[PDB]
Write a protein that binds this ligand. Structure first.
Ligand SMILES: [Mg+2]
Ligand SMILES: [Mg+2]
Ligand SMILES: [Zn+2]
Ligand SMILES: [Zn+2]
Lengths: 314, 314
């Protein structure tokens, strides 16, 4: 019934795509008390346009809003323009900053269009990087947690070569990913999670038979994490421990270790959470759908599912 | 309901464990015609013991058998003894040799006890090594293919550290794994399979953005394999390609890339195939269960499932 139990920022994404419309459709479905917890970031001109189209002008007067990503000309639904790409980033940047300052507790970003952003002369390799940028952090102090089909898997390393990942793996890096993910677990509604840590090597090195990495890295980190009062198993072979399915958080050492389970078990309904400082940012799982922008075809299911996940009750 | 469509060798494993028992229980379940296609390798003294226990002396006279791993003293159920470890290897070695010479078309090995084998002074790091040894092959020509829930995944590297795996990965090594696995696919009943190759790095390096390894190793190997008239896709991100579920054989670069999907989708029903030369050897998916040996309560389902897989029709 009630799916929003905390303050959230909602950036409307590309103002020429379906973002604005699906924002309105989602808010419409919430209670009045729930809407008052969602602050919207984006050009008012685009919410106005979407509202006239969907016939939801009734809803704007009940809407908490902050102008961001203002445009210099009227909205053009369906069109890829540099100005809409700038709007996209400006709005998401405004939402993130509201989270960094503590006005809200998490952020959702409606769909962006990669080309739009690029044609504005702005570098963009996904939400993990953007968040790193806006917060003043190295990209490897922001972690990606995938959530899908009961699995939550945080990744200690992400988009780099296996060798490069192995060379950067330290006890401290593992610890950071876990504390970041555990804090994120509180938000998702699991205050005291059971955590499993993957081995770097097959069979978590099987003592030291298959390498020293786990002795040096995952084993020390698990002991440090227990001393701080965390319920932690491992390191264990990622295959073996994942299969048992008795943990609320798995910790993956390498991209593929976490990405394979999630995409196999949840090809259609997974969330990608970028975590950094206090900020948890999740997309919706779909594109901006330029061809149907303004045409009343896109429903807000995926956004509502993201809101529900980030807005869970303690 | 006929599951055996070719000649097989069945090595009964540790004669003190549940191997002999589960051999008898599985053969019992077959037709008379089917039993005549399964040649049994092991000490007769242990099949005698198991038959009295399971009340299947009726079955022995209709059994194709070759003495191998004879004992010098009576069988002792439940006991870990060096002589039982030697028996184990001798009998599996006898079955493999029947496959190399072409008396049979594949081998199944009932459970071994690793300690027993070790106490006999015999080096043993799993079936891949044994088979390399007996056949006169380098250990890096012998590959493990996991089969479970429709997925067939051969591994280019296996039980070693990630670094060590990356350091030996070459175009030629990938090629060998594929040709070994393709030949094995014929046996399993997929004569001309569609092959997908995993990337070494996330997103198969995304060109060269996440490392050089894929451009040096998987990309050249896929081209060499196509020119020889094989239907091969990739390299692709293991997550992405696995998710499409439109290939008869996946090629994993690293242990975990293949072991995670299999143990997630099939925590019981996974078979492990050691491939070398023309010889395909599969374990049963469980240990020798010394605690229950002689008690007559061991389930032959896993063995029957292995027989069905290796005895497939086409
Ligand atoms: Mg493993
Ligand atoms: Mg490359
Ligand atoms: Zn990725
Ligand atoms: Zn293994």
């Amino acid at each position: 019934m009630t799916i929003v139990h905390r303050r959230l920022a909602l950036a409307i994404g590309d103002p020429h795509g379906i973002g604005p419309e699906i924002a309105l459709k989602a808010l419409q479905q919430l209670s009045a008390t729930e809407r008052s917890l969602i602050k919207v970031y984006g050009p008012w001109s685009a919410l106005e346009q979407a509202a006239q189209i969907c016939q939801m002008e009734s809803l704007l007067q009940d809407l908490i809003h902050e102008e961001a990503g203002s445009l210099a000309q009227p909205v053009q639904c369906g069109e890829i323009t540099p100005q809409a790409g700038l709007s996209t980033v400006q709005s998401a940047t405004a939402a993130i900053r509201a989270c960094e300052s503590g006005e809200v507790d998490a952020v959702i970003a409606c769909p962006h269009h990669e080309t739009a952003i690029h044609r504005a002369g702005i570098a963009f390799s996904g939400y993990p990087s953007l968040l790193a940028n806006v917060l003043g952090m190295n990209e490897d102090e922001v972690f990606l947690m995938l959530v899908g089909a009961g699995l939550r898997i945080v990744h200690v390393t992400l988009h780099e070569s296996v060798r490069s990942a192995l060379e950067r793996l330290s006890p401290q890096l593992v610890i950071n990913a876990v504390d970041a993910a555990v804090q994120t677990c509180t938000l998702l509604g699991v205050p005291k999670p059971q955590v499993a840590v993957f081995g770097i090597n097959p069979h978590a090195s099987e003592g030291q038979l298959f390498g020293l990495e786990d002795s040096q890295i995952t084993v020390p980190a698990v002991e440090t994490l227990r001393k701080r009062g965390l319920t932690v198993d491992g390191p264990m072979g990622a295959d073996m421990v994942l299969a048992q399915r008795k943990h609320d958080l798995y910790v993956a050492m390498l991209h593929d270790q976490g990405h394979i389970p999630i995409k196999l078990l949840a090809p259609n309904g997974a969330s990608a959470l970028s975590i950094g400082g206090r900020v948890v940012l999740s997309s919706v799982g779909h594109g901006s759908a330029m061809d149907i922008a303004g045409r009343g075809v896109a429903d807000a299911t995926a956004l509502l599912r993201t809101i529900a996940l980030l807005g869970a009750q303690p």
